[PDB]
């Protein structure tokens, strides 16, 4: 047997008390009334998750697989990557990253304190000398917020991560590799090179490039658990194709043998929970490995299915394919063959894929293309998503400070959307005004990495990522309007006419503050008035350093880019 996990029966334990019920304050009702619809996952459901993620993996690897792999390795061989110094790697550590078990924390690391640096060096030396001993990991249940979907409650997802010292060593060995290799190997198919607008451009251009377009998303069941020892060694063989220093080569070999392939699982109480033989969700290579492995399996599956003129877009375990239609029956047939190949590769689907002939109806990375109209009346395509989870998370953040501010990330990613503009902007700017906290920088995450963002910089950030049109879109699609309306009914969110009324108040209060606050009032809330101000390029926008923002995925990888 080739089991993803083996377990001792020891429990996955929490670090602090965990809340599952939505916390309520005086502001909660202004956002939503159906409080019992929002929950957070806790370690209490960890056993249910363990059951779901534990299975035997079988893998049959054919000529299509090896052909694509050869191609990937040929591209990888053009990459030159560098070792990061200790200091460079230390500066990439989030200020609140989990402290080391060895007597120092993330602040000590960021400050280059002697004890941290010395220990990191000792971890590094040990990686070079020893390429066999499994490195310890901690297993935790993630506390994440969702809306109930009777389609009831998700069990908590699991996070598996090594000690802080090792994580700094992972950056040193592989940060440059995971940041540069995937776009070289996968080209335009690598999803994390795109801002949301650029992703939309690629998808729309790809769709228009087909005579008779068909598209489909592919949902792998428990992707991390599907990743085998084979997959992880194949990933390492790809990394090693790069032009690397011998010390980097040795560290990558060692991290592969000792950490990436598998290792002991330890709870928060120091007890042995069992043993992992699949992808660790909390390592630097999580996003890059998943993306490469998904792309490899899917590219080979496309060949097996004989899909005509197909283009892929891959973000970790998330996959969308757009190809040439051969008719509805022939397409259904192709997807069945595609699915069979993926399954043989260890990657069977949760929901079976279905052919889609309307681009707007294809969901990938929880998102879809939709269309609205700019100030001139021109059709504009933009990225959107079902607002349920963003709004459930905003409900939580209304009553509780959290390490990651999802509302702020969601405004950045989904600025052009009806719901981010009318609800998220209005609600959160009301709150920040009330506490006079417009100037206070908040942590958020973009493609897995951590940023400290000042809400007063939102107009310039949005202009840079989405263009000026994000401040003037109107006439959204009836499909998008219905979806938003359905979500508001479900969660008990006030109707859009109430948000319009509130936004006029927010806009006025922001304008009354002048400076950056007034720019926010002017640009972010121009949709809320009949008396529309003239929106011109903001000078500060061109000065914003937004490099590294949409380059690569770092989910689980403990990266701070501020
Ligand atoms: Zn065997």
From Swiss-Prot:
Q: Impact of mutating residue 290 to K?
A: Complete loss of RdRp activity
Q: How is its activity regulated?
A: Activity is up-regulated by PRK2/PKN2-mediated phosphorylation.
On the tree of life, the source organism's domain of life is Viruses
Which compartment or compartments is the protein found in? Host cytoplasm; Host endoplasmic reticulum membrane
Q: How is the cofactor bound?
A: Binds 2 magnesium ion that constitute a dinuclear catalytic metal center.
> Residues that bind Mg(2+) 2, according to the entry?
219, 317-318
| Membrane disposition | Single-pass type IV membrane protein
How does it get modified after it is made?
Answer: The N-terminus is phosphorylated by host PRK2/PKN2.
**What reaction(s) does this enzyme catalyze?**
RNA(n) + a ribonucleoside 5'-triphosphate = RNA(n+1) + diphosphate
Upon changing residue 285 to V, the result is: Almost complete loss of RdRp activity
Cofactor section: Mg(2+)
RdRp catalytic domain location: 213-331
Q: What is the effect of changing residue 286 to K?
A: Complete loss of RdRp activity
**Residue list for modification Phosphoserine:** 30, 43
The role this protein plays is: RNA-dependent RNA polymerase that performs primer-template recognition and RNA synthesis during viral replication. Initiates RNA transcription/replication at a flavin adenine dinucleotide (FAD), resulting in a 5'- FAD cap on viral RNAs. In this way, recognition of viral 5' RNA by host pattern recognition receptors can be bypassed, thereby evading activation of antiviral pathways.
Listed under subunit, the entry gives:
Homooligomer. Interacts with non-structural protein 5A. Interacts with host VAPB. Interacts with host PRK2/PKN2. Interacts with host HNRNPA1 and SEPT6; these interactions facilitate the viral replication. Part of the replication complex composed of NS2, NS3, NS4A, NS4B, NS5A and the RNA-directed RNA polymerase embedded in an ER-derived membranous web.
Put simply, this protein is called RNA-directed RNA polymerase
Source organism of the structure: Hepatitis C virus genotype 1b (isolate BK)
From the broadest rank down, the organism's phylogenetic lineage runs: Viruses, Riboviria, Orthornavirae, Kitrinoviricota, Flasuviricetes
């Amino acid at each position: 047997h080739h089991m993803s996990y083996t377990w001792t029966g020891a429990l996955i334990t929490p670090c602090a008390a965990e809340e599952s019920k939505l916390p309520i304050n005086a502001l909660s009702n202004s956002l939503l009334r159906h409080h019992n619809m929002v929950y957070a996952t806790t370690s209490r459901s960890a056993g249910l998750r363990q059951k779901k993620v534990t299975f035997d993996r079988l893998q049959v690897l054919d000529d299509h697989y090896r052909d694509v792999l050869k191609e990937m390795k040929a591209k990888a061989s053009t990459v030159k990557a560098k070792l990061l110094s200790v200091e460079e790697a230390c500066k990439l550590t989030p200020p609140h990253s989990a402290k080391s078990k060895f007597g120092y924390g993330a602040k000590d690391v960021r400050n280059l304190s002697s004890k941290a640096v010395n220990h990191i060096h000792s971890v590094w030396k040990d990686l070079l000398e020893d390429t066999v001993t499994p490195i310890d990991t901690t297993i935790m249940a993630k506390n994440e917020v969702f809306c109930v979907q009777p389609e009831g409650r998700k069990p908590a997802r699991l996070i598996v991560f090594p000690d802080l010292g090792v994580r700094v060593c992972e950056k040193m060995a592989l940060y440059d590799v995971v940041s540069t290799l995937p776009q070289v190997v996968m080209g335009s198919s690598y999803g994390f090179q795109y801002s949301p607008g650029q992703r939309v451009e690629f998808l729309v251009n790809t769709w228009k490039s087909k005579k008779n377009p068909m598209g489909f998303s592919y949902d792998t069941r428990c992707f991390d658990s599907t990743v085998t020892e084979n997959d992880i060694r194949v990933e390492e063989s790809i990394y090693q194709c790069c032009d690397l220093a011998p010390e980097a080569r040795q560290a990558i070999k060692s991290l592969t043998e000792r950490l990436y392939i598998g290792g002991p699982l330890t709870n928060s109480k120091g007890q042995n929970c069992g043993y992992r033989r699949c992808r660790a969700s909390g390592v630097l290579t999580t996003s890059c490995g998943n993306t490469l492995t998904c792309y490899l399996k899917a590219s080979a599956a496309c060949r097996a299915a004989k899909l005509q003129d197909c283009t892929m877009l891959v973000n970790g375990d998330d996959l969308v394919v757009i190809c040439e239609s051969a008719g509805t029956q022939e397409d259904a047939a192709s997807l069945r063959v595609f699915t069979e190949a993926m399954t043989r590769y260890s990657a069977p689907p949760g929901d079976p894929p279905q052919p889609e002939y309307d681009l707007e109806l294809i969901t990938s990375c929880s998102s879809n293309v939709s269309v609205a109209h700019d100030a001139s009346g021109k059709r504009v395509y933009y990225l959107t998503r079902d607002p349920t989870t963003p709004l459930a998370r905003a409900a939580w953040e209304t009553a509780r400070h959290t390490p990651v501010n999802s509302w702020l990330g969601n405004i950045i990613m989904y600025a052009p959307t009806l719901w981010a503009r009318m609800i998220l902007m209005t609600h959160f700017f009301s709150i920040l005004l009330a506490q006079e906290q417009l100037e206070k920088a908040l942590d958020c995450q973009i493609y897995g990495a951590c940023y400290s963002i000042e809400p007063l910089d939102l107009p310039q950030i949005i202009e840079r990522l989405h263009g000026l049109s994000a401040f003037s879109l109107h006439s959204y699609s009836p499909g998008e309007i219905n979806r938003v309306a359905s979500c508001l009914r479900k969660l008990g969110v006030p109707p859009l006419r109430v948000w319009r009324h509130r936004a006029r108040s927010v806009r006025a209060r922001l304008l009354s503050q002048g400076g950056r606050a007034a720019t926010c009032g002017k640009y972010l809330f121009n949709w809320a008035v009949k008396t529309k101000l003239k929106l011109t390029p903001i000078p500060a926008a061109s000065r914003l350093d937004l490099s590294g923002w949409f380059v690569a995925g770092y989910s689980g990888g403990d990266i701070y880019h501020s």
